[model samples]
Target: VKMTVTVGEERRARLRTAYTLTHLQEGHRTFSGFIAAALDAEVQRLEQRYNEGRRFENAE
Candidate 1:
């Protein structure tokens, strides 16, 4: 699997450091480990922001 995006230096730097932590502390070894873990975080964030304590429109 592959995906790409353009981000500002701020986001890029943030992810680089996050990846370092995940690899060193959590031992995430796969090439997509950082991306996968990061997206998982993002998904939960949005779920809390928009749909906390409720179900999505079609997810019921």
Candidate 2:
């Protein structure tokens, strides 16, 4: 997923637009590959865990 932090109305709007555009722009690539390369490696690490078998023990 595309993620951004922006201040004020204009940049926030731009960020929202970019969130949609980025997904369209990434269609040819594997989502995990892009995420693995883009986000923090730790994020990738935990994502893999979640995808494989990670679970919340106390989630309600």
Candidate 3:
């Protein structure tokens, strides 16, 4: 499936504020990498829940 996702202004601001400290160092890749790994897991979890027709189990 092809999908396009966009973040709203509030979320964009939140992300920038929260991640700035972690990215202050020019080569600090750890924070970005950590968020990436976490989001991957979250997406997989959501997909599994959706495929199992368990949407009512949790309202994310």
Q: Using lDDT as the measure, which candidate wins?
A: 1
Please provide, for model 1 over 1-60, each residue's C-alpha lDDT reduced to its tens digit, 9 standing for 90 to 100: 657767789988887777876676776786377778777778778888899935356664
Model 3: per-residue Cα lDDT over 1-60, one tens digit each: 755347789986786666776565544466566457657778778877776734334666
lDDT of all the models against the reference?
Answer: 0.73, 0.57, 0.64
For candidate 1, the per-residue lDDT at 1 reads 60
Q: Please give the lDDT score for candidate 2.
A: 0.57
Task: Judge candidate 3 against the unseen true structure and give its global Cα lDDT, from 0 to 1.
Answer: 0.64
Runs in model 1 with CA error above 4 Å? 8-22, 53-60
Q: Candidate 2 residues 1-57, lDDT tens each?
A: 756533689855775565556856766255445444555656557767885735335
Please give each candidate's TM-score.
0.50, 0.30, 0.40
- Any idea what lDDT model 1 has? 0.73
Candidate 3 clash pair list: none
Q: Model 1: number of clashes?
A: 0
